[PDB]
């Protein structure tokens, strides 16, 4: 009934702390490698954003899980629920920016490289859009009592229609749209390479196909289970009473793999 620390939770928070440590170590090593070019700038900023998420969200998620109930303060919860979604948006926008930069470099090399403003324009706009679209969390989230404690969106949104609308908006800005633009950008890269073919062009074509499929697979694997449970709850809120405790616990552990996977995949498929 009242959410407590069942067996499915101690393991969850232990694994969450383990993933925190692994993500921090991996991204620190990747930053050390990158410090020692435009691609370098974008990759370094992406790894820094992944550090921001790993150091903000995973400790937050673990703290709620191991230490159930959230009473630290309405304002504190509101700022933390801003920082969470902000650090969540940042990697996706950075991925989109990287894909756009690659597409502009390959498809239109002569003209794209002529403007150095885009080196700062896109990196600035990624953070700016993250901050601007991550705000709405401030007004909804808040500390809620009744005498259980937890920080929930109940009441802020008049109807479940509005909850579905906001959830779908964040879903689109998080998962569907960044993946679609990465796929489209790499598709245009492959189309341009094919037109050129129609020495090293075949090798680059193979590596771009590998990179597209690898990033798609990693992103999908990470954010499929998360949003499967999310959509189940979203359309049929009763699933929690349709109790499945390990289900409710262990699927949202994967979405923190994306901060872990980004350094590895980018380091292997780039440098």
């Amino acid at each position: 009934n009242l959410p407590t620390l069942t067996l499915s939770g101690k393991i969850r928070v232990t694994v969450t702390f383990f993933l925190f440590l692994l993500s921090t170590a991996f991204n620190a090593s990747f930053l050390l490698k990158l410090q020692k070019s435009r691609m370098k700038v974008l990759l370094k900023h992406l790894t820094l954003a992944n550090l921001l998420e790993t150091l903000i969200v995973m400790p937050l998620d673990g703290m709620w899980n191991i230490t159930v109930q959230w009473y630290a303060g309405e304002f504190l919860c509101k700022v933390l629920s801003y920082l969470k979604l902000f650090s969540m948006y940042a990697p996706a926008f950075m991925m989109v920016v990287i894909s756009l930069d690659r597409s502009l470099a390959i498809t239109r090399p002569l003209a794209v490289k002529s403007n150095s403003r885009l080196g700062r324009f896109m990196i600035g706009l990624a953070w700016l859009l993250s901050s601007i679209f991550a705000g709405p969390q401030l007004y909804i989230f808040r500390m809620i009592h009744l005498g259980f404690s937890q920080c929930v969106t109940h009441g802020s949104f008049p109807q479940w229609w509005h909850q579905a609308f906001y959830n779908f908006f964040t879903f689109s800005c998080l998962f569907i749209i960044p993946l679609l633009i990465m796929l489209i950008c790499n598709a245009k890269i492959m189309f341009t390479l094919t037109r050129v073919l129609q020495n090293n062009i075949p090798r680059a074509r193979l590596r771009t196909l590998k990179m597209t499929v690898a990033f798609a697979a990693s992103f999908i694997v990470c954010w499929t289970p998360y949003y499967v449970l999310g959509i189940w709850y979203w359309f049929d809120p009763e699933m929690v009473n349709r109790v499945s405790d390990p289900v409710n616990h262990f699927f949202f552990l994967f979405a923190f793999l994306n901060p872990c996977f980004d350094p590895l995949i980018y380091g292997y498929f780039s440098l």
């Binding site: 959410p3 998620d61 709620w64 920080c151």
Partner: peptide, 10 residues
Amino acid sequence: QHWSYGLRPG
């Protein structure tokens, strides 16, 4: 869970 998963430690 950037959403609220019931009264659970989202």
